[PDB]
Amino acid sequence: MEHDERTHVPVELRAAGVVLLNERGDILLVQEKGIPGHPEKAGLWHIPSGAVEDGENPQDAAVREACEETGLRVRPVKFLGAYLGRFPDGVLILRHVWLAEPEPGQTLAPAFTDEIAEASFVSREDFAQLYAAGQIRMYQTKLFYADALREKGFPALPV
Amino acid sequence: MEHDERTHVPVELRAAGVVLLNERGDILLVQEKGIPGHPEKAGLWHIPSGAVEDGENPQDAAVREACEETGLRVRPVKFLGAYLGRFPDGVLILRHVWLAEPEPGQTLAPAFTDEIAEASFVSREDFAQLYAAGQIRMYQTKLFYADALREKGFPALPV
Ligand SMILES: Nc1ncnc2c1ncn2[C@@H]1O[C@H](COP(=O)(O)OP(=O)(O)OP(=O)(O)O)[C@@H](O)[C@H]1O
Ligand SMILES: Nc1ncnc2c1ncn2[C@@H]1O[C@H](COP(=O)(O)OP(=O)(O)OP(=O)(O)O)[C@@H](O)[C@H]1O
Ligand SMILES: [Mg+2]
Ligand SMILES: [Mg+2]
Ligand SMILES: [Mg+2]
Ligand SMILES: [Mg+2]
Ligand SMILES: [Mg+2]
Ligand SMILES: [Mg+2]
């Protein structure tokens, strides 16, 4: 919108994920297999998310990725936000996040790969511990988890 | 998700709007209060959108802006996409777009301001003429309109 000129900033990559909360306000997180190189790794945690195919709807991608990584069919409830990152080579990536809910009567069955060690529901209290411990890959996860808790009417994160 | 390092690219401004279609697949557009040119304003057209307050939900902003500019209460149906622009001074603006539908039993009553001349529903055929005529401010409007038509199962656009 509106008549103030601006140039286009091409975004080569797009990712879409979800902040999936269960009835208790626990968050579904995915753990990386291990850290790249040093000690005997111990992967960090992040929200279920993946690449949006070129031209495909980001919201649908978030739903698809969530199922592919956790085995759970989820329903997008509300868009929470998108943020921008830039890889060393200059490539831009726009990450999208939706507040989602799992369809009823499902069993968590993560897709173990060279990138995913497992996935699981983590309570607000333990999430606070993970965050303080530097175990949450992207700090934005805490920001969006907080947004989701507010949206659903759940208690805020202790830390 | 990912362990590949990337830097943060701050986005100072956020806008949110809608591709609002009625039952016939006509699109709701807003016209500028004349473009500055030579003797002639003749306003360009764009979808209803507006600024997202810092910290406010983008989706809710799209709904709010749509009502403020057209007088119509709309519901958000599905996220369509977001794209990035950069003003001459370097400021980045991320525009968000949702497919939306108006609540039933409403009357179009545009908010006339120094920025808005009027707003109205335009058919697919006339939209194509407007686009060919260079009267659509942001070409992305055509891209998203086409996305919306596909999502709703409406026939495609002549432009
Ligand atoms: N220009 C680039 N330079 C360096 N690495 C890149 C670039 N583009 C993408 N990546 C690599 O490709 C993958 C980027 O992720 P992609 O957008 O495909 O999906 P995603 O896993 O949902 O998002 P994220 O990039 O965090 O993995 C990165 O994990 C990284 O290894
Ligand atoms: N740093 C900046 N430098 C120059 N112009 C700016 C800057 N920030 C915002 N603008 C102008 O502000 C307006 C955007 O305001 P806002 O985000 O509220 O609504 P918008 O319609 O979504 O944005 P825009 O009209 O810019 O696409 C535009 O007219 C744009 O040119
Ligand atoms: Mg994938
Ligand atoms: Mg990608
Ligand atoms: Mg991802
Ligand atoms: Mg706008
Ligand atoms: Mg406004
Ligand atoms: Mg703004």
Side-chain angles (χ1 to χ4, degrees):
Chain A
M1 163 184 217
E2 215 52 350
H3 76 191
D4 283 354
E5 303 187 308
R6 78 294 304 287
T7 52
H8 183 64
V9 185
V11 174
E12 302 98 325
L13 300 175
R14 270 149 195 158
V18 302
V19 193
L20 191 295
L21 307 182
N22 62 11
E23 333 53 56
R24 296 188 301 277
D26 303 321
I27 182 171
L28 176 59
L29 298 176
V30 180
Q31 182 177 34
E32 321 168 320
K33 197 132 27 301
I35 321 269
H38 252 69
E40 236 355 49
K41 45 280 219 226
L44 301 199
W45 300 80
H46 57 70
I47 66 173
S49 176
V52 176
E53 311 301 298
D54 190 61
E56 73 153 336
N57 185 278
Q59 184 182 298
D60 290 335
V63 170
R64 148 182 81 67
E65 281 299 324
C67 185
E68 279 180 30
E69 308 192 326
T70 72
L72 299 178
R73 297 208 156 315
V74 310
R75 336 171 26 323
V77 180
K78 184 176 186 175
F79 173 79
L80 295 183
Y83 62 100
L84 193 65
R86 190 189 295 283
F87 289 106
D89 62 4
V91 171
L92 287 177
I93 178 167
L94 184 62
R95 292 174 58 74
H96 309 241
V97 183
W98 275 267
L99 154 74
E101 85 190 16
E103 301 195 312
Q106 286 185 284
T107 302
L108 184 60
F112 310 122
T113 67
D114 298 328
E115 293 296 71
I116 300 173
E118 67 190 82
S120 60
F121 280 98
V122 176
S123 71
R124 70 206 46 175
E125 291 74 23
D126 288 318
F127 176 85
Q129 290 283 17
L130 289 174
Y131 186 77
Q135 303 306 300
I136 302 302
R137 178 60 69 182
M138 304 186 82
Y139 65 77
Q140 286 86 350
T141 297
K142 177 172 178 179
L143 294 177
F144 286 115
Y145 185 11
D147 296 320
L149 289 168
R150 284 196 290 284
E151 284 285 351
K152 301 299 295 70
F154 282 117
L157 286 172
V159 36
Chain B
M1 95 209 345
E2 225 13 75
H3 51 191
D4 276 41
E5 303 186 306
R6 78 293 304 285
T7 53
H8 182 63
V9 186
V11 173
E12 302 99 323
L13 300 174
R14 341 147 54 138
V18 300
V19 167
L20 188 300
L21 304 184
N22 63 11
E23 297 305 298
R24 296 187 301 276
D26 306 322
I27 183 170
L28 176 58
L29 298 173
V30 180
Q31 181 177 35
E32 319 167 326
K33 196 149 280 185
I35 71 174
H38 137 101
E40 244 262 320
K41 250 47 45 219
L44 291 199
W45 300 81
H46 56 72
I47 58 175
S49 112
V52 177
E53 314 311 305
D54 192 61
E56 104 164 285
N57 186 277
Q59 188 181 300
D60 292 335
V63 172
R64 160 172 69 83
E65 281 299 324
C67 187
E68 282 180 23
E69 307 191 329
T70 72
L72 299 178
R73 301 296 186 299
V74 310
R75 15 83 138 240
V77 178
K78 185 177 187 176
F79 174 78
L80 294 182
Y83 62 99
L84 193 65
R86 189 190 296 282
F87 290 105
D89 61 5
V91 171
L92 286 177
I93 178 168
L94 185 61
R95 292 173 57 75
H96 310 240
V97 183
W98 275 267
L99 162 64
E101 293 171 4
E103 302 193 314
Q106 286 186 286
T107 302
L108 182 59
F112 310 124
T113 68
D114 303 68
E115 306 285 60
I116 298 174
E118 66 190 83
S120 6
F121 281 98
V122 177
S123 71
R124 286 169 35 270
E125 292 74 24
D126 287 319
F127 176 86
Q129 291 282 16
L130 286 177
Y131 186 77
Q135 303 305 302
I136 301 302
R137 178 61 69 183
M138 304 188 83
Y139 66 77
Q140 285 87 347
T141 298
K142 177 172 177 178
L143 295 176
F144 286 115
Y145 188 8
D147 296 322
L149 291 168
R150 287 196 291 281
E151 284 286 355
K152 298 297 298 153
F154 281 117
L157 309 134
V159 323

